[PDB]
Amino acid sequence: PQITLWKRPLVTIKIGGQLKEALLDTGADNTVIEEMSLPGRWKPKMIGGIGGFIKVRQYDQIIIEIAGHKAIGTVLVGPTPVNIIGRNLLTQIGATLNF
Amino acid sequence: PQITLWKRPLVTIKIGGQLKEALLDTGADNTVIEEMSLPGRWKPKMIGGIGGFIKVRQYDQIIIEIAGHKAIGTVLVGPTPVNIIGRNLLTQIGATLNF
Numbered sequence: 001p002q003i004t005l006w007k008r009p010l011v012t013i014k015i016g017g018q019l020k021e022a023l024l025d026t027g028a029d030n031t032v033i034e035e036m037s038l039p040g041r042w043k044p045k046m047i048g049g050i051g052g053f054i055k056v057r058q059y060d061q062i063i064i065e066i067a068g069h070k071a072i073g074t075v076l077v078g079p080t081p082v083n084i085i086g087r088n089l090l091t092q093i094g095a096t097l098n099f
Numbered sequence: 100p101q102i103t104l105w106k107r108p109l110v111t112i113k114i115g116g117q118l119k120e121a122l123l124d125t126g127a128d129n130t131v132i133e134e135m136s137l138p139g140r141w142k143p144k145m146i147g148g149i150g151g152f153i154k155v156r157q158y159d160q161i162i163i164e165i166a167g168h169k170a171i172g173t174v175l176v177g178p179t180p181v182n183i184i185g186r187n188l189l190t191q192i193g194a195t196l197n198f
């Protein structure tokens with residue numbers, strides 16, 4: 001689709017068998033989801049933002065369905081105030097900014 | 100232009116006669132710039148992200164060029180880690196997300 005930016009670009013995602021709402025976020029290098037369980041191995045990471053850093057768990061090779069499009073990549077899980085789809089998975093669904 | 104997201108979507112902006120680099124950020128409601136002097140009065144605002152909240156100075160009706168497109172609108176000034184162009188000015192330059 002083409003999504004205008006009058007409102008937050010929120011979409012439905014499926015991750016870990018769960019449906020969630022998430023922000024399509026071109027200012028995010030990585031995908032960061034609120035606390036949930038994911039299978040397999042993980043390692044700790046710190047990620048920064050406007051107001052400092054949070055500690056997250058980094059899971060690699062996770063499949064997510066984003067507004068109907070499947071993609072695979074790293075997902076960070078931790079106390080983010082919003083679920084964010086960052087550039088590592090936006091590229092995979094072929095998202096671009098146009099003006 | 101059509102901007103892919105394999106790299107950060109950094110563009111050149113011009114504000115107060117100076118050039119700066121900024122991120123086109125669909126996950127940001129608000130444009131937030133690092134400390135600089137702007138004319139006129141400002142109003143307080145608290146914004147929040149990953150890590151938590153920060154206090155910023157809100158300047159309204161500021162002239163700013165973004166990737167060669169003129170915008171005139173609200174700019175928040177504060178301790179953001181990077182200059183961010185949010186939806187309030189992305190809409191003024193005609194930006195959409197597409198996939």
Ligand SMILES: COc1ccc(S(=O)(=O)N(CC(C)C)C[C@@H](O)[C@H](Cc2ccccc2)NC(=O)O[C@H]2CO[C@H]3O[C@@H]4OCC[C@@H]4[C@H]32)cc1
Nearest residue numbers: 025027028029030048049050082126127128129147148149
């Ligand atoms: C390494 O991978 C990462 C690293 C950092 C981040 S981030 O969330 O800190 N952020 C990076 C950016 C500051 C360079 C992505 C942004 O899109 C966040 C994404 C974000 C959204 C909401 C809450 C937390 C984060 N937006 C944001 O901070 O917006 C601020 C400014 O305007 C307001 O609009 C937003 O909505 C109201 C609050 C925020 C305020 C994500 C993945």
Ligand SMILES: [Cl-]
Nearest residue numbers: 072073074088
């Ligand atoms: Cl990845």
Ligand SMILES: [Cl-]
Nearest residue numbers: 091094103104
């Ligand atoms: Cl591509």
Ligand code: NA
Nearest residue numbers: 040041060061
């Ligand atoms: Na894994």
